[PDB]
RNA sequence: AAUUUCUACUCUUGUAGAUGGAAAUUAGGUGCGCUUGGC
DNA sequence: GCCAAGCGCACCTAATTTCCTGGAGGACTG
DNA sequence: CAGTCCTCCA
């Protein structure tokens, strides 16, 4: 039966191993005289340069075609609906089978096999495409067919300096199929069409018309908002919904406009916007009358589309020039400041403000647009001139002050230009002093910057700080200027008014000054990158095999535990082989790899037999058998029965399974497979390269069942590696005269002074090459392997005089904390230049320090020129590509394993991740937070970290980045969770996404588990590096997720967290409905009774969970009613002696504390509650809509069991039911078998809702999990056993 | 405070854990500036 | 001060596709 | 023309 163990060897997993390559003899010295690294930077440029030129090609071709497109869109649209309706295994087949069926229609029109074209313009767009992703797009043909355009001349030496040598393009070929391609297929431009954009296109017309059905007058609106952008003139705005109209919106510039008609168009900055659809609907909202609550009731924003791929973006909206350089910059701003200096422009300024202290301030006018930034500015709140003016005015209002008189001051303040003198009336005398104060600063900073010169360039930050120092001061006078009104109809005094505008108009380069600045010195500066190396080799390093190593040009060796490398160049331009001579083990010398590898037997057979030009030639006019004899020991004779058998007028063929599926007709589909597989074992007999092989563990061919099962057999026999003895002399004699460039494969783990554990990648690599690996292939090493050279990029360090730190004291525990760390460094250092702070003297007998005794040197790997090795290998060799079943075969495993425990893994509110361990009934074992990993407090670093980002974005210096650090606080997860997986044989639960550090989380976690290798399990173990653990399903995409991965689970996340542990109650109410007076009544009408409880000091409410049924959330769990308990506010302690309030809450943020308030409310009505009569219909008959509104606000924070409170530390769970035993359960208790807290609480809950699928998977007579966790069955199934 | 590379380290000229590359594309985010508005 | 809808710029981050090849075939050489 | 070697098929 099934076991743990047995998790493995299920699917072959591809990996990339990194190294350093170490030049050995005189390979340096050769290489440099050569030239080679030159060249190869050279033809890396030349790729850089010469990409887009091609990607010219693509882009107008794909364009020409997508114009002719034109498809009716309702049966997709139709597809789509059925499967949102019913949510079935059945409708979303029929949409992926509907997104096929499109996607193909479209790619036809690149292929030329459209009935919507003619016959003359299918054959030429079929020519062009024969010809777009080889070398043929470089013998510029197919421009003569897509237009004009001729190529020039530094275009041609481009081109030419590609000769010979193509191939280097030809993983750009595929990045072209990527897409044109018609699969499923997010690169592709008919999944970007097809599943992209137009369910968005299909949503924009839907939500277009429940609009301007509900509000007709938007259609007008929308209409004018087309006219006035000027686009699609010839289209109504309905047509613009429609799908007819989808076929033009296939093209980037059609796509462009249509979003410009959703977001509108800017010009220059400071100048108003052009509004489009979303910004109308916003703003129409924003209005706050009758007709916005309707809008804002509907969706109400329009989808923009995604771009086409490939295709430029293109905008109808400004775009600033650019500074190019340093000089420009400086020079360009310094010829401003000293025209601000002529014009004098701040003595005008300090003058026009100085006039405020005597002329007429009633015809100095405050924009109103500008008068919340002004009180923010000049008061203690954005709202304080706005309210003073509002009280002023309201005192000055004749008659009775109605709430419409009211209303009527209110608006006008959003429409009027405030005269100053009103202002400084309504808000006093200290508004009028801030307003000095504020502008003597602005005032003054500007004269700084004005006299303080420009930095020489902008190389070093300080530099660049002065410039943005002094923009800033300008800006800020630009925007002190702008705070006045503009408005014709104000009555401006005309000589002030006259002046201000005038150095407004000086001061408006400001702005464009500004920005352009940003834009430029936030650049980031050109930095050093690896590149390719080819050694002038268009197929280096391209495969391993014997037969190829003179045109591939690369060998492996091992002498004594170390690895080389060895790469052949051409010799006087021609390739050489070298002929290396075995000899005997008892020679010294380099053991030698010798590499075997007959690829896919799938694609090279027929390559190799069927598919030869001679033999399907022969086939056109013949019916009789050909017998080939080049490379065959006997000859392989091809009949037509063989031939038609790969070669079908119509897929699929006859002998893959589809042709079972479809026909029906296993007694063909088996004799077909039988006679494909037979054919296959005469081909391999024959075939010099596999006429040695031993296939005699094949089992006989009839016994196979499919062909991927064969082939799975088939293709570990087709590869081999061996090493044979090469004498030393011969080695050293080929590096000293140029014909070997030797190179050592390096990492740290073959340093002299290694002695720990290797890094896991060794181990994959020492394992490749071990000898039971040899005799039996788990590992294989890939072809396609890359050679880099990577310039040295940086120049700190700690010299051998000096000092280190430790990071941790005497006691190897305690860590120093960091800001004492660099304090303590630099005092041992004699580089403090003040007094040791207490804490840090505090510290100094018990830190560690040592003695430099050799340099060791900050980013060192960086500081010189480095050479690299990349090198793929494939895992689980013996296993299929694919896995079948794989599901299944967990699920196989966990009903014969009732007792696997489960791993819930939460993202929490003050937690990174959460976990949580249970049994398989529910007890906790385990919970933690992960925050802190071994004493490294991670969850601070990171915050830190992207405090620092943000705050040097705003400086316009370095960003640098955070990816580093969250993949290093990732990989300690990961093996935190690993581990307990393994030691517990657990499931582990994570969150359904579609209900940043999590997410990425997810994909390691998955990415781990498809081939888990335990670096101190032995080699031969399962879990050891030849028998990797196989726990998740093999990774695809995202997308392409099910909510099971093998042993991972995927559940939602609602009900989760605000979730009773003991009795699995949810607050029911939904909030929003209980808002006014009389459904306040009704919701306390809806409970059986609320009374106090003498023996406990309790308040007890009875709700039956079928009433107030207008008020809930539609969830009636498993109970039919609960009491609901305010528990007396009494004095409990924790586990270690901390006191805390029974009950309490914390509410929006203050401590409430419900049964006090409650007794406080009654005996404020004199309601009798201590004869434990019911409360609420005394408060009901008594009708007091205070009292009814603090019951119903108490009740809701009865039931608000989180509570918590950032600056205290709080945030626990407090049940308002007490259990089957009494218990009101509260994480305060600090109970280590219970939720600790909110976050664990949310861990231990999705962990249970994996025990909620194991549960039914154990019930269920087959072997498929079920596909989601509706909130209802949740609760009916957690309530149920809690119960 | 050394690295194939990342993170955390320093008994140890190195230690612990992680690490699928390259190409291509697309999406999103942060920050700054600006527009019309809401609070 | 925060927020909504939106436009411009700077750089950072992540997801999703492909390949992980020997030898047939023929263009280019001398 | 025969040998070389870049290109790209399955
Ligand atoms: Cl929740
Ligand atoms: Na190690
Ligand atoms: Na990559
Ligand atoms: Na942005
Ligand atoms: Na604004
Ligand atoms: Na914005």
């Not at 949102?84 to 997104?99: G, H, P, S």
């Not at 100095?364 to 203690?380: P, V």
């Not at 830190?847 to 980013?859: A, F, G, L, R």
């Amino acid at each position: 039966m099934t076991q743990f163990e047995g998790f493995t060897n299920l699917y072959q997993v591809s990996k990339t191993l990194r190294f350093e390559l170490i030049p050995q003899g005189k390979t340096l010295k050769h290489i440099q005289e050569q030239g080679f690294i030159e060249e190869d930077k050279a033809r890396n440029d030349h790729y850089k340069e010469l990409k887009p030129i091609i990607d010219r090609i693509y882009k107008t071709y794909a364009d020409q075609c997508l114009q002719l497109v034109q498809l009716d869109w309702e049966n997709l649209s139709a597809a789509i609906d059925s499967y949102r309706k019913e949510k079935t295994e059945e409708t979303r087949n029929a949409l992926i089978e509907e997104q096929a069926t499109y996607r193909n229609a479209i790619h036809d029109y690149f292929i030329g096999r459209t009935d919507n074209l003619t016959d003359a313009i299918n054959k030429r767009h079929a020519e062009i495409y024969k010809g777009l992703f080889k070398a043929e797009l470089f013998n510029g043909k197919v421009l003569k067919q897509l237009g004009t355009v001729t190529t020039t001349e530094h275009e041609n030496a481009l081109l030419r300096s590609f000769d010979k040598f193509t191939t280097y393009f030809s993983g750009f070929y595929e990045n072209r199929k990527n897409v044109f391609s018609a699969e499923d297929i997010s690169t592709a431009i008919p999944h970007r069409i097809v599943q992209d954009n137009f369910p968005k296109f299909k949503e924009n017309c839907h939500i277009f018309t429940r609009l301007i059905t509900a509000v007709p007058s938007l259609r007008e609106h929308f209409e004018n908002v087309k006219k006035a952008i000027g686009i699609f003139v010839s289209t109504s705005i309905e047509e613009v919904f429609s799908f007819p109209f989808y076929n033009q919106l296939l093209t980037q510039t059609q796509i462009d406009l249509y979003n410009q008609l959703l977001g509108g168009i800017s010009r220059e900055a400071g100048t108003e916007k052009i509004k489009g659809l979303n910004e109308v609907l916003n703003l129409a909202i924003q209005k706050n009358d009758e007709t916005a609550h309707i809008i804002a009731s509907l969706p109400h924003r329009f989808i923009p589309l995604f771009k086409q791929i490939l295709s430029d973006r293109n905008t109808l909206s400004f775009i600033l020039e650019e500074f190019k350089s340093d000089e420009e910059v400086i020079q360009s701003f310094c010829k401003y400041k000293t025209l601000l200096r002529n014009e004098n422009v701040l003595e005008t300024a300090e003058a026009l403000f100085n006039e405020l202290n005597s002329i007429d301030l009633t015809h100095i006018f405050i924009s109103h647009k500008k008068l919340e930034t002004i009180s923010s500015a000049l008061c203690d709140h954005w709202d304080t001139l706005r309210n003073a003016l509002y009280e002023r005015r309201i005192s000055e209002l004749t008659g009775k002050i109605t709430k419409s008189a009211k209303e009527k001051v209110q608006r006008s303040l959003k429409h009027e230009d405030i005269n100053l003198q009103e202002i400084i009336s309504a808000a006093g005398k200290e508004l009028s002093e801030a307003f000095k104060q504020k502008t003597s600063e602005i005032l003054s900073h500007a004269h700084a910057a004005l006299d303080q010169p420009l930095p020489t360039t902008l190389k070093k930050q300080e530099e660049k700080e002065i410039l943005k120092s002094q923009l800033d001061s300008l800006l800020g006078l630009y925007h002190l200027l702008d705070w006045f009104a503009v408005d014709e109809s104000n009555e401006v005094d005309p000589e002030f008014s006259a002046r201000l505008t005038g150095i407004k108009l000086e001061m408006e380069p400001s702005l464009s000054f500004y920005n352009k600045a940003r834009n430029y010195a936030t650049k980031k500066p050109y930095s050093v990158e690896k590149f390719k190396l080819n050694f002038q080799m268009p197929t280096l390093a391209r495969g391993w095999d014997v037969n190829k190593e003179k045109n591939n040009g690369a060998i492996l060796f091992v002498k004594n535990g170390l690895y080389y490398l060895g790469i052949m160049p051409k010799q006087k331009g021609r390739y050489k082989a070298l002929s290396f001579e075995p000899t005997e083990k008892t020679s010294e010398g380099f053991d030698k790899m010798y590499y075997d590898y007959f690829p896919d037997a799938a694609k090279m057979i027929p390559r190799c037999s069927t598919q030869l030009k001679a033999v399907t030639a022969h086939f056109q006019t013949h019916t009789t058998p050909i017998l080939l004899s080049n490379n065959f020991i006997e000859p392989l004779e091809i009949t037509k029965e063989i031939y038609d058998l790969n070669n079908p007028e119509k897929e699929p063929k006859k002998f893959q399974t589809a042709y079972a599926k479809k026909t029906g007709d296993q007694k063909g589909y088996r004799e077909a497979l039988c006679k494909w597989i037979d054919f296959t074992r005469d081909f391999l007999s024959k075939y010099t390269k596999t006429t040695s092989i031993d296939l005699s563990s094949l089992r006989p061919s009839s016994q196979y069942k499919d062909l991927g099962e064969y082939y799975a057999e088939l293709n570990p026999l087709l590869y081999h590696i061996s090493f044979q003895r090469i004498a030393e002399k011969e080695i050293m004699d080929a590096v000293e005269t140029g014909k070997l460039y030797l190179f050592q494969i390096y990492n740290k783990d073959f340093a002299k002074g290694h002695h720990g554990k290797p890094n896991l990648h060794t181990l994959y690599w020492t394992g490749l090459f071990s000898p039971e690996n040899l005799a039996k292939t788990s590992i294989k090493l890939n072809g396609q392997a890359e050679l880099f050279y990577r310039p040295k990029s940086r120049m700190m360090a700690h010299r051998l005089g000096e000092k280190m730190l430790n990071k941790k004291l005497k006691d190897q525990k305690t860590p120093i904390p960091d800001t004492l760390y660099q304090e303590l460094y630099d005092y041992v250092n004699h580089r403090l230049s003040h007094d040791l702070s207490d804490e840090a003297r505090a510290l100094l007998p018990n830190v560690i320090t040592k003695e430099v005794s050799h340099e060791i040197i900050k980013d060192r790997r960086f500081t010189s020129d480095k050479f690299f090795f990349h090198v793929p290998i494939t895992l689980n060799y013996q296993a299929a590509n694919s896995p079948s079943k794989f599901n299944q075969r967990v699920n196989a495993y966990l009903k014969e394993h009732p007792e696997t425990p489960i791993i819930g893994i939460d993202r929490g509110e003050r937690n990174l991740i959460y976990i949580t361990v249970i049994d398989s009934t529910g007890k906790i074992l385990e919970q933690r937070s992960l925050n802190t990993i071994q004493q490294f407090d991670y969850q601070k670093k990171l915050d830190n970290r992207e405090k620092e980002r943000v705050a040097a974005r705003q400086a316009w210096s370095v960003v640098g980045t955070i990816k580093d650090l969250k993949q290093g606080y990732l990989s300690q997860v990961i093996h935190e969770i690993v581990d307990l997986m393994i030691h517990y044989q657990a499931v582990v639960v994570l969150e359904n996404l579609n209900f940043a550090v999590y997410q990425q989380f997810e994909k390691m976690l998955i990415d781990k588990l498809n081939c888990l290798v335990l670096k101190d399990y032995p080699a031969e173990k399962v879990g050891g590096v030849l028998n990797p653990y196989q726990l998740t399903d093999q990774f695809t995409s995202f997308a392409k997720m099910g909510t099971q991965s093998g042993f991972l689970f995927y559940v939602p996340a609602p009900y989760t967290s605000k979730i009773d542990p003991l009795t699995g109650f949810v607050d029911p109410f939904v909030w929003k409905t209980i808002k006014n007076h009389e459904s306040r009544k009704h919701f306390l009408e809806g409970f059986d009774f609320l009374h106090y409880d003498v023996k406990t000091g309790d308040f007890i409410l009875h709700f039956k969970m079928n009433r107030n049924l207008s008020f809930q959330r539609g969830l009636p769990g498993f109970m039919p009613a609960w009491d609901i308990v305010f528990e007396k506010n009494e004095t409990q302690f924790d586990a270690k002696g901390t006191p805390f309030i029974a009950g309490k809450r914390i509410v929006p943020y203050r401590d409430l504390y419900p049964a006090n308030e409650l007794i406080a409310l009654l005996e404020e009505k004199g309601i009798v509650f201590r004869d434990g009569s019911n409360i609420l219909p005394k408060l009901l008959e008594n009708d007091d809509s205070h009292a009814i509104d603090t019951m119903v606000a108490l009740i809701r924070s009865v039931l608000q069991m989180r509570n918590s409170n950032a600056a205290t530390g709080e945030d626990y769970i407090n049940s308002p039911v007490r259990d089957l035993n009494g218990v009101c359960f509260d994480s305060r208790f600090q109970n280590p078998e219970w939720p600790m807290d909110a976050d664990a609480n949310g861990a231990y809950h999705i962990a249970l809702k994996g025990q909620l699928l194991l549960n039914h998977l154990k019930e269920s007579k087959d072997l498929k999990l079920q596909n989601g966790i509706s909130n209802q069955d949740w609760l009916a199934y957690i309530q149920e056993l809690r119960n």
